[PDB]
Write a protein that binds this DNA or RNA. Structure first.
Lengths: 367, 367
DNA sequence: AAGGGTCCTAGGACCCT
DNA sequence: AAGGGTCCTAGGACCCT
């Protein structure tokens, strides 16, 4: 039942990728830009004040020497993202992606094989790699401690391979489940790793200051909890199950309250190939006529090239729009003969259009 | 590209099952009853006027000697239904269920193996089993005709095995796709079979009198088509694609208009194990208090026994209700420890209840 | 005028009796 | 006061940047 899970969290991923392609930008503070947004920055810029998702106006304010590169095209980030996941899959095949720059790996079966290969002698010599959360003392006779320290050794091999083979730095967190791994991976945050022994789990969850810091408690759920006086992790731990169920659902309540104790039995999922491919175009109410077909041909151009190289074929297309004030969409299957090309796809899309600041196209239902 | 598909359609299935268990009822006219509904009748009752889905009041009217058995419990029908599908899967593994008493089998690869085993001599001796739709002449030099006649020979072996091994009679229809197979299987309808040669396909589709007779054109779609003056198969064939797309959707329009020509490239799907397990209880506004928990324990009792014997475990439960005037429902995942029992399931359900003439419970999301 | 992902949910269309 | 099935759809909650 007992698991060893690692969470791998790349430092400022878009920035890293841009700094590799143009070493010119290392040393100088770097911001990666999407419209008016500095969506990530290298660490020199984080020293000078730049925060994730800051206005490009605010960001030059706090740092007029800030270099900006455009990050509206995710192609390179996406490709390097899969290079990371694939490398980790070599260590153990069950890798779960979370966004482009985080991965989960269930190391249990791998930790176990390594322990079976040791003799009693060196067992007393198992050492941690990296930080131990909360400076907690190790008990080498605790088989749980021993297995997590091996997990920490694998975690370090992972981060080293990632640097040696892909030039990427990153953090890792080793714990007994996904929640705890992800919470502990960030404790020492520039390119380091931390392992969480069971005795310090409550210290970990209680180190959080707002409930939204729990992965799984989002913009809506946090807001609903604040509206019930629930504000700290302990508040959620002690709050009435019953009231919580009736207010948010048996599903949401029962799951975030388990999370509030640091419990999380959800398995590491094999993410494998993507389930969808999409692209977006945003713009200040810059589309007011049906000649927004050109934007839709643009997105199609790139998506068609992405799906081709994938191999699998999508069997659904979806068009998404945003109006000047939620999003709205319309999907439909992709005709059989189309699966086996630009021109049929656009009128399909424009029929979806007419049936209905941003245009997006999504290819899902892949076979 | 060219396919040989068979559609197997059991005669008055619930009635057959009841007549087997109580041979007393053969010979005498039989109605199977669900509340006020005669939902199926053996053929003697069909001679005396009883129609599918007739009021039990109307049905005794037209036939006061009509025997009625209760068919609100589908257990026996369901079990025999899977005995049929399994038998057919022995012939070729790709079997698609449609309801409890219809199956599709793609016989293409099987027809092909049989032809490769024949010599030119007996090839000129291939014969049809059963009816040829529209009394159409066979051309033994037409390789399509030859392959469909083999399909008709397999179809007859199927129906014979079904009778010899399960005691069930039934019809079969052999054609080049699922739509045509299903439309032709009923042409000679008490326990017979029909094969459709390509030359007679238009005669087949045009033999229909209302569009709703096309599988895939239902209560809503037929009504919308009538409201556009589309009433015959030919009307749908000739109607404007454009208008049809804008009125019903690119998906619905493009698919039912292909159907109107007898075109249907949808593959035979391997149905395999069920995707859900549900049970219903209806009643004349017979539930007005939370003591409708008893009905919910009842449904659970049986569903739990069904899911146990299945093997796979559901990971979702759904409660459905109907109010006195659409249905409404609420679902939620099934806790992990529950998957591995009555008592936790009911309060879950009753929380779903309170969050909201019929009660139903459904177990889906199976793993 | 981010730009991507994941899975779930309630309802609705269809199929058969 | 049928009593079962199938898959799709638009939207919404969450994750990351």
């Amino acid at each position: 039942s007992s698991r060893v899970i690692v969470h791998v969290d790349l430092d400022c991923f878009y920035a890293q990728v841009e700094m590799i392609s143009n070493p010119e930008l290392k040393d100088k503070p770097l911001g990666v830009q999407q419209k008016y947004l500095v969506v990530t920055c290298n660490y020199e810029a984080r020293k000078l004040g730049v925060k994730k998702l800051m206005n490009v106006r605010d960001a030059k304010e706090k740092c007029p020497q800030l270099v900006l590169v455009n990050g509206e095209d995710l192609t390179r980030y996406r490709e390097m993202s899969y290079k990371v996941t694939e490398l980790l899959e070599e260590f153990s095949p069950v890798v779960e992606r979370l966004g482009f720059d985080e991965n989960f790996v269930d190391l249990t079966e791998m930790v176990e094989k390594r322990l079976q290969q040791l003799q009693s002698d060196e067992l007393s010599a198992v050492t941690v790699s990296g930080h131990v959360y909360n400076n907690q003392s190790i008990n080498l006779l605790d088989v749980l401690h021993i297995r997590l320290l091996v997990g920490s050794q694998i975690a370090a091999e992972m981060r080293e391979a990632m640097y040696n083979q892909l030039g990427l730095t990153g953090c890792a967190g080793v714990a007994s489940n996904k929640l705890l791994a992800k919470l502990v991976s960030g404790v020492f945050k520039p390119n380091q790793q931390t392992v969480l022994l069971p005795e310090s789990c409550q210290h970990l969850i209680h180190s959080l200051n707002h409930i939204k810091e729990i992965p799984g408690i989002g913009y809506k759920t946090a807001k609903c909890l604040e509206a019930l006086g629930i504000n700290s992790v302990r508040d959620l731990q002690t709050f009435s199950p019953k009231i919580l169920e009736k207010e948010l659902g048996i599903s949401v309540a029962q799951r975030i309250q388990k999370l509030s104790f640091g419990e999380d039995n959800s398995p590491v999922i094999l993410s494998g190939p993507p389930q969808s491919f999409s692209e977006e175009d945003s713009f200040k109410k810059c589309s007011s006529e049906v000649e927004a077909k050109n934007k839709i041909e643009e997105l199609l151009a790139s998506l068609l090239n992405r799906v081709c190289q994938d191999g699998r074929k999508p069997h659904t297309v979806r068009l998404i729009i945003r109006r000047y004030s939620g999003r709205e969409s319309r999907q439909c299957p992709i005709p059989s003969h189309v699966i086996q090309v630009m021109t049929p796809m656009v009128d399909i899309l424009m029929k979806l259009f007419r049936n209905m600041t941003l245009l997006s196209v999504c290819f899902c239902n892949l076979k």
